[PDB]
Structures are given as structure tokens and as C-alpha cells.
Design a protein around this nucleic acid. Structure first.
Ligand SMILES: [Mg+2]
Ligand SMILES: [Mg+2]
Ligand SMILES: [Zn+2]
Lengths: 71, 102, 111, 102, 41, 90
RNA sequence: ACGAAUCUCUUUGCCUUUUGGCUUAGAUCAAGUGUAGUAUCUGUUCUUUUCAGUGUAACAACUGAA
RNA sequence: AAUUUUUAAGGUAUGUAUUUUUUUU
């Protein structure tokens, strides 16, 4: 039951400062400072002788997966 | 058959209270302004202390009645249905909601 | 494992719906193949173990030892293990009784 | 680095509890199920409408039918009695015995 | 009006197949039943 | 090897399964001494489930049965799933 | 008869936590025995013809024939 | 024909009260 999360404004109205307390993070150090603008006996003998489905699990790629890694 | 939208319901209750009020008036017959300041725009309206006390008493009384009738449905509600197994009151109450769902 | 079991269930439902893949012709030819071979070799079909059979106790000893070697190593036993080891120890304490139990199950029990 | 395992323990006291303690717990819950959660009152407690109304508990722990004056070992036995032909009769006899007076 | 959710896997706190077979199976077993009787004769 | 179920330990299942549902079998054996989860579940499915059918046999069933048992040789779960009945009855 | 107020009652309608989430069901684990003996529920049978014996505190019960 | 060295954290809880000079009837 997360229900109502947290509003920003109450965190945006805190009296720390405009910035945070003044902690200097490592990812806010200046980077990419400039913008960029656009412009025959043997043969005879035997008895038996001579589409994309939309789903993950019933797909064709999936059966190949469980055909191998489940051995 | 049927449910009623919160509009029509509101109207019906309005009418009900109109009738009740008219009966208070008739039985009372049987037993027998606007000023706005120049300094501030605050408006004031003369009031009879009577009928205001009668109003408060009406509201309180109706609240009492409603609360009591619902309470009686509380009482009967639990005493009527003993058929299925129940661990606690809340269970029985829920399963009566299951009776309403049918 | 949850995926694998799902593919198993899908496969078996589809074999209920479609039916078997053998066809009766292929099955007939296969059956002919066996019968002709077993005639050529003059095979004597395996009997059912008689009431007094010479080797019953020995075939037990082999079976029960095969079952006991699993728990020879194990350390902390779950409940099912203790249940099994109870069954094996009883199988040593009444071999004849457990032979009758076995053969009886070979007859009657289909579920 | 034994964190690799994945078991652990809370730092409080001495865990498992004693087989006798489990039975007490298990025989209360079983008599809660079969009872369908009702509180069967003691005989001395000076009467929450009962599901029925005859069953009680004496000064000892046993269950008793106050109509039939029978003593019962468990809820399972009671449901045998309440479904019995003697507890049927004593309701009819009290039925007549009331229908002859008020 | 929504039902009330009842789970088989949890009961926290309070609050207490149709189709038949195929002709595939019918036909296969006959062929095995016939072919066997023929071979047993 | 008995594991026999008295009418008390049958009456406690149906009250336990009602409470805990059918997938918590480990908890059902907590209410029930003498019996493990695999024993509790196995009885609920084979006997006590009220959706089971224990009833007399119509004249079409013994025809339906002897049809299946012939067309499927010994497979008594597959038949029972066709018959919608517990196997050891079928 | 009727406009019409108030208490009582049934119904329709309104309705309460109508389970706090998530993952590999999150994981795993469970019942001593033997000898003697009593207590307590339920199910089934009988209140139904005479006399003679056994029996009982008295019944009951048991034993024969019309 | 050449490797390479170590410190923290996930384990022993956590919470409450406790040394005070007597606020005017
Ligand atoms: Mg920990
Ligand atoms: Mg962590
Ligand atoms: Zn009674």
C-alpha cells in the first residue's frame, strides 16, 4: 500500500538552501561544459525404408532455449 | 429498478425536509434584512433566535434517529445469520456482503 | 524450472488435443519388427516372481544396499530420509514380510 | 566472510522451545478451528449471544451441556452430541415444557 | 461491483476441464489390439 | 505404514484447508499431529475435496469406462481426468 | 373518506480493513515406547402376551412350553 | 619473454528513567 508517494514541493520548500546543504557531489562537478548547436540387398531390408506468434513463452525462440539449457 | 444517482437523491431529500418543515409550521399555527457597513463591505442579516434553535434541534434529532436505525440494523444483522462457520464478527459481516453479491 | 514445467504442460495438453504422432501404420510395423525378432531369437518371456523364488532375498540385498548407499554419506537428515531409512531397516528385519508386500504391490496397485 | 552462506540469527534468546510447549499451542488452535472461533463461556461467569446457547465450561475445564447434563472431552465430542438424538429430545421436552406455560 | 479477493496462497490476519479424447487414440489402440491378436494366433 | 485418518483428523483438515487454503500445506500439518504435509495434501486431493465425485455409476459410465480402459490401456490418471473422478475409484 | 404530523415494523437502497507491498510458494524445519486401569460422547437393539425355575435389597436380567 | 601483497561495513541490539534546593494563595 504505497498509496500517496511523496510530493516534491515539501522537499522543495525546505530551508536548507536553494542548493542542498552545500554538499558537493562527485557527479555534479562540471562536465561537458559546452553545448552543441545544429546547423542393393542392404537398402531393401529395413521395415521403414524409403510466422511470428506474439508471446514470449509460446514463441519459437523460447522452445529452442528450453530445448538446450534444460537439456 | 434500481440505484439512483446522487442528484435525484439530493432532490428527494430536499422535498422530504420541505414537507417536514411545512408540518412544523402548520402545527405551530395550530398551537397558536440586509445591512452593509460603509467602512467594510461586510453584510449583516437580522435573525430570529427562534427557528435557529429549532433548526439545530432538528439536525441533532435526525442525526440521532439515523444513527439509531442503522444501529438496529447492526443488532439484527449479526443475530439473524448463524448458518456458515465464522471465526469473528468481521468474518460474518463479510460473508453477509457475499450474500449481497448474489 | 517454472518455465520448463510450463513447456511440459503445454506439450502434453497439445498431445491431448492433436493426438498421438505415431499413426497406426507405423505402430503396426514396429510391432511386427519386435515379434519377428523375438521369434528369431526364441526368447522366453520373463515370468512373474514366484512365491518361493530362489533369488528373492539376494535381489533384495542388492536393492536395499543400493538404496542405503545414498544415506551412508548424509549428515543431517530431513524427515523423508528418516522415513526411508526406517523402511530399509524394517526391510532387513523382516525380509519375508517385505517380499510379500512387494509382490502384492506388483499385482494390485495401479495408482 | 561467512556471509556467503545466507542463514542467520536474531540476537535474542534461546530459540526452539520445548516439545511440551508446542502441544499446548496446537491443542488450543485445534479447539479454535472446530469451535469456529466461538467463546464458550464458563459456568460461573454471570451472563454476546452464543451460537447455540447451552454449551459451557464447568469450574474444571470440561465442556458441558446444561440441558442434557452431559460432560464432554472435546469440541469434536460436543458436535457429536449437538448432532445426537438425545440432545434433540431434551429440546423438544423443553419445547413442550415451555408451550404449557408462560 | 468488484468481488472480494481471496487468495489460495495467503490468508493474512482475519477474513477467513472439459474436452474429450481424439480419434487418434481410438484408432491406434485397435491397430495394436488387432495386430497382436493376429500375431498371437 | 498405516497413516490412517480418523474422523477427527479428517474434520481438522477441512477446517484447516478452509483457513489456510490449498497451497500452504506446511501450515496444515502444524494443526495436525501424526501427519506430514505430503500426507495432508494427498488426502485432500484423493478424498476430502468436496469437488470430488463419489457417487453411484450410471449406465453410460461403465460404457465410457470400459471404452477408455480399452483404448487407453493401464493409465488410470489419464482416464480419471477424462471421467472427472478420482483414480482409485475409477 | 381526506390534507397531515410522531413512535413501531418489513422491503428496496446505502454499507463497514472487502487481508498492507515485493522475490527463488522469499527459504527451511516438525509425531517416543511398554504394562495395568478408569472416565466420557455417539451409533444400534428393547417399555410387548401368561405361568415354572435361576437371579436381585426389590426390580432387571436369564432359562422353558400355550 | 615474469605475478604482487589492504583496509572499513553487512554480529552481538535498541528504547525509557535516573546527579536537580522546596515560585508567593
Ligand atoms: Mg541478519
Ligand atoms: Mg544488505
Ligand atoms: Zn444436550
Amino acid at each position: 500500500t504505497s498509496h500517496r508517494p511523496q510530493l516534491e514541493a515539501r522537499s522543495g520548500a525546505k530551508a536548507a538552501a536553494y542548493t542542498p546543504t552545500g554538499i558537493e557531489h562527485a557527479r555534479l562537478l562540471p562536465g561537458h561544459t559546452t553545448l552543441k548547436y545544429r546547423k542393393r540387398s542392404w537398402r531393401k531390408g529395413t521395415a521403414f525404408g524409403r510466422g511470428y506468434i506474439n508471446d514470449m513463452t509460446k514463441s519459437e525462440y523460447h522452445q529452442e532455449f528450453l530445448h538446450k539449457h534444460v537439456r | 429498478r434500481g440505484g439512483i444517482s446522487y442528484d435525484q437523491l439530493a432532490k428527494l431529500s430536499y422535498e422530504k425536509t420541505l414537507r417536514n418543515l411545512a408540518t412544523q409550521t402548520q402545527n405551530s399555527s395550530k398551537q397558536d434584512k440586509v445591512q452593509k457597513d460603509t467602512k467594510t463591505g461586510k453584510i449583516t442579516i437580522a435573525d430570529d433566535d427562534k427557528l435557529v434553535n429549532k433548526l439545530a434541534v432538528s439536525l441533532q434529532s435526525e442525526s440521532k434517529k439515523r444513527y439509531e436505525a442503522r444501529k438496529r440494523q447492526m443488532q439484527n444483522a449479526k443475530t439473524l445469520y448463524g448458518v456458515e462457520s465464522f471465526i469473528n464478527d468481521k468474518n460474518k459481516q463479510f460473508n453477509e456482503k457475499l450474500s449481497r453479491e448474489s | 524450472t517454472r518455465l520448463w514445467i510450463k513447456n511440459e504442460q503445454e506439450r502434453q495438453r497439445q498431445i491431448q488435443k492433436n493426438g498421438p504422432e505415431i499413426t497406426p501404420e507405423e505402430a503396426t510395423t514396429i510391432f511386427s519388427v519386435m515379434v519377428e525378432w523375438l521369434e528369431s531369437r526364441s526368447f522366453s518371456p520373463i515370468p512373474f516372481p514366484p512365491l518361493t523364488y530362489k533369488n528373492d532375498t539376494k535381489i533384495l540385498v542388492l536393492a536395499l544396499e543400493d538404496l542405503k548407499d545414498v544415506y551412508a554419506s548424509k549428515v543431517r537428515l530431513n524427515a523423508s530420509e528418516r522415513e526411508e531409512l526406517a523402511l530399509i531397516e524394517e526391510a532387513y528385519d523382516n525380509p519375508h514380510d517385505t517380499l510379500n508386500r512387494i509382490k502384492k504391490y506388483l499385482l494390485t496397485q495401479r495408482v | 566472510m561467512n556471509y556467503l552462506e545466507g542463514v542467520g540469527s536474531k540476537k535474542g534468546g534461546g530459540g526452539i522451545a520445548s516439545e511440551s510447549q508446542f502441544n499446548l499451542q496446537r491443542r488450543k488452535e485445534v479447539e479454535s478451528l472446530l469451535s469456529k472461533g466461538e467463546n464458550v463461556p464458563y459456568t460461573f461467569q454471570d451472563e454476546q449471544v452464543r451460537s447455540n446457547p447451552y454449551i459451557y465450561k464447568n469450574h474444571s475445564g470440561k465442556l458441558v451441556c446444561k440441558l442434557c447434563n452431559t460432560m464432554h472431552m472435546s469440541w469434536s465430542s460436543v458436535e457429536r452430541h449437538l448432532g445426537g438424538k438425545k440432545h434433540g429430545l431434551n429440546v423438544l421436552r423443553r419445547g413442550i415444557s415451555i408451550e404449557k406455560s408462560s | 461491483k468488484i468481488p472480494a479477493a481471496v487468495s489460495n496462497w495467503k490468508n493474512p490476519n482475519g477474513y477467513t476441464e472439459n474436452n474429450t479424447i481424439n480419434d487418434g487414440f481410438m484408432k491406434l489402440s485397435e491397430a495394436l489390439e488387432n495386430a497382436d491378436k493376429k500375431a498371437r494366433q | 505404514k498405516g497413516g490412517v485418518w480418523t474422523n477427527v483428523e479428517d474434520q481438522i483438515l477441512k477446517a484447516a484447508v478452509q483457513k489456510y487454503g490449498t497451497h500452504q500445506w506446511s501450515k496444515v500439518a502444524s494443526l495436525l499431529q501424526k501427519k506430514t504435509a505430503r500426507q495432508s495434501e494427498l488426502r485432500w486431493n484423493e478424498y476430502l475435496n468436496p469437488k470430488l465425485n463419489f457417487t453411484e455409476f450410471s449406465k453410460e459410465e461403465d460404457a465410457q469406462l470400459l471404452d477408455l480402459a480399452r483404448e487407453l490401456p493401464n493409465q488410470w490418471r489419464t482416464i480419471a481426468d477424462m471421467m472427472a473422478r478420482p483414480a482409485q475409484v475409477c
